[PDB]
Design an enzyme around this catalytic site. Sequence first.
Site, PDB file in Angstrom:
ATOM      1  CG  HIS A  58       0.018  10.300   7.812  1.00  0.00           C
ATOM      2  ND1 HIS A  58      -1.016   9.513   6.791  1.00  0.00           N
ATOM      3  CD2 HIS A  58      -0.265  11.462   7.299  1.00  0.00           C
ATOM      4  CE1 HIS A  58      -1.742  10.444   6.396  1.00  0.00           C
ATOM      5  NE2 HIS A  58      -1.431  11.671   6.647  1.00  0.00           N
TER       6      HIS A  58
ATOM      7  CD  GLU B  84      -4.291   9.529   3.280  1.00  0.00           C
ATOM      8  OE1 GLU B  84      -4.180   9.345   4.369  1.00  0.00           O
ATOM      9  OE2 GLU B  84      -4.636   8.338   2.542  1.00  0.00           O
TER      10      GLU B  84
ATOM     11  CB  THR C 218      -6.129   7.833   6.174  1.00  0.00           C
ATOM     12  OG1 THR C 218      -4.932   7.393   5.733  1.00  0.00           O
ATOM     13  CG2 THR C 218      -6.243   9.117   7.008  1.00  0.00           C
ATOM     14  CB  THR C 219      -5.174   2.194   5.443  1.00  0.00           C
ATOM     15  OG1 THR C 219      -4.383   2.105   6.692  1.00  0.00           O
ATOM     16  CG2 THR C 219      -4.025   3.359   4.755  1.00  0.00           C
TER      17      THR C 219
ATOM     18  CG  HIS D  22      -1.584  -1.232   1.400  1.00  0.00           C
ATOM     19  ND1 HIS D  22      -2.729  -1.819   0.533  1.00  0.00           N
ATOM     20  CD2 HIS D  22      -1.630  -2.113   2.278  1.00  0.00           C
ATOM     21  CE1 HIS D  22      -3.263  -3.024   1.015  1.00  0.00           C
ATOM     22  NE2 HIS D  22      -2.451  -3.162   1.882  1.00  0.00           N
TER      23      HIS D  22
ATOM     24  CG  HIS E 136       2.320   5.665   6.319  1.00  0.00           C
ATOM     25  ND1 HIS E 136       2.503   5.465   7.618  1.00  0.00           N
ATOM     26  CD2 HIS E 136       1.468   6.138   5.845  1.00  0.00           C
ATOM     27  CE1 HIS E 136       0.948   6.099   7.911  1.00  0.00           C
ATOM     28  NE2 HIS E 136       0.706   6.293   6.715  1.00  0.00           N
TER      29      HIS E 136
ATOM     30  CG  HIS F 149      -1.049   8.431   2.633  1.00  0.00           C
ATOM     31  ND1 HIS F 149      -1.757   7.213   2.301  1.00  0.00           N
ATOM     32  CD2 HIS F 149      -0.624   8.499   3.676  1.00  0.00           C
ATOM     33  CE1 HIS F 149      -2.029   6.859   3.622  1.00  0.00           C
ATOM     34  NE2 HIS F 149      -1.362   7.799   4.394  1.00  0.00           N
TER      35      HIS F 149
HETATM   36  C1  LIG Z   1      -3.523  -2.844  14.885  1.00  0.00           C
HETATM   37  C2  LIG Z   1      -2.412  -3.752  13.988  1.00  0.00           C
HETATM   38  C3  LIG Z   1      -1.572  -4.390  14.831  1.00  0.00           C
HETATM   39  C4  LIG Z   1      -1.719  -2.850  12.880  1.00  0.00           C
HETATM   40  C5  LIG Z   1      -2.529  -2.093  11.853  1.00  0.00           C
HETATM   41  N1  LIG Z   1      -1.663  -1.426  11.185  1.00  0.00           N
HETATM   42  C6  LIG Z   1      -1.891   0.001  10.880  1.00  0.00           C
HETATM   43  S1  LIG Z   1      -3.475   0.834  11.846  1.00  0.00           S
HETATM   44  N2  LIG Z   1      -1.232   0.703   9.933  1.00  0.00           N
HETATM   45  C7  LIG Z   1      -1.622   1.977   9.575  1.00  0.00           C
HETATM   46  C8  LIG Z   1      -2.403   2.232   8.677  1.00  0.00           C
HETATM   47  C9  LIG Z   1      -2.758   3.635   8.229  1.00  0.00           C
HETATM   48  C10 LIG Z   1      -2.082   4.421   9.244  1.00  0.00           C
HETATM   49  S2  LIG Z   1      -2.647   6.136   8.916  1.00  0.00           S
HETATM   50  N3  LIG Z   1      -2.757   6.575   7.363  1.00  0.00           N
HETATM   51  O1  LIG Z   1      -3.882   6.572   9.630  1.00  0.00           O
HETATM   52  O2  LIG Z   1      -1.513   7.190   9.364  1.00  0.00           O
HETATM   53  C11 LIG Z   1      -1.375   4.178  10.334  1.00  0.00           C
HETATM   54  C12 LIG Z   1      -0.985   2.796  10.403  1.00  0.00           C
HETATM   55 CL1  LIG Z   1       0.188   2.442  11.651  1.00  0.00          CL
HETATM   56  C13 LIG Z   1      -3.396  -3.119  11.185  1.00  0.00           C
HETATM   57  C14 LIG Z   1      -4.091  -4.101  12.371  1.00  0.00           C
HETATM   58  C15 LIG Z   1      -5.219  -3.220  13.012  1.00  0.00           C
HETATM   59  C16 LIG Z   1      -5.278  -5.235  11.377  1.00  0.00           C
HETATM   60  N4  LIG Z   1      -3.204  -4.741  13.326  1.00  0.00           N
HETATM   61  O3  LIG Z   1      -2.434  -5.424  12.322  1.00  0.00           O
HETATM   62 ZN   LIG Z   2      -1.138   7.521   6.387  1.00  0.00          ZN
END
Ligand SMILES: CC1(C)CC(NC(=S)Nc2ccc(S(N)(=O)=O)cc2Cl)CC(C)(C)N1O
Ligand SMILES: [Zn+2]
Length: 256
Positions: free
Chosen positions: A116, A103, A195-196, A61, A91, A93
Amino acid sequence: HWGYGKHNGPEHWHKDFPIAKGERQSPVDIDTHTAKYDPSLKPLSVSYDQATSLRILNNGHAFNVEFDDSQDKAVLKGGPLDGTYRLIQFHFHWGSLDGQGSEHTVDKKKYAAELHLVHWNTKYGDFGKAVQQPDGLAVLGIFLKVGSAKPGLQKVVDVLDSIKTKGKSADFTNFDPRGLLPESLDYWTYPGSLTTPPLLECVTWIVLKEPISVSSEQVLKFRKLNFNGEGEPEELMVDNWRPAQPLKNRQIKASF
Ligand SMILES: CC1(C)CC(NC(=S)Nc2ccc(S(N)(=O)=O)cc2Cl)CC(C)(C)N1O
Ligand SMILES: [Zn+2]
Ligand SMILES: [Hg+2]
């Protein structure tokens, strides 16, 4: 599974993750004339001097630069926050073109990209527990525009070759995230979400007003990454951003 394409993108996410249509979804448009200065905001404290990066991962992603969060080192505190939030990863976007990629938007303006920096609330012991809490996460959002190169981004740029496809990772120690910050810490803040998927409503967003500049050649290398795994048809990793979601009466506060 979920992605950013026509058949699995942001319009489809609600089917597996109903919270996609929730009351505190992110990102949002920041309407600068509706945002109110908040005198009750304490100064923002970003302490990244002791940060310990471990590795960089293409997760199909985006790419995550992950940090050792087993001790209080890189911490975000103050501003709208109560207590201490530990840096776990950052990371970006970005877009297929300079005119899109961010975003959050500012008076509907889309930036070329968005960084982010993700932090979890230490009162909850670990990241997995924190994402089950309304105040479990704090994400520092920084806009990228195209102009002069960002010297502190180059180490990231140069390693992307080694993680072209989904599932690839590389050792990424001793990266200093201080080199990604703009001069000013002026910010807008609102309560929101990841946001994912799983789009959990656990985030205090802190979005910096001042963007960082990155070079055209730096962003171009972002666009060379792949959504697909090794040996699969090439799907360029671009436009991995969720568009602005309904504010729903929430209030965006300004630090300035
Ligand atoms: C909560 C945990 C342990 C990590 C989660 N990984 C995330 S929430 N990744 C993530 C996805 C999106 C963002 S963002 N774009 O909001 O900053 C920040 C992060 Cl750390 C996925 C799920 C909830 C299924 N598990 O694996
Ligand atoms: Zn993000
Ligand atoms: Hg939550």
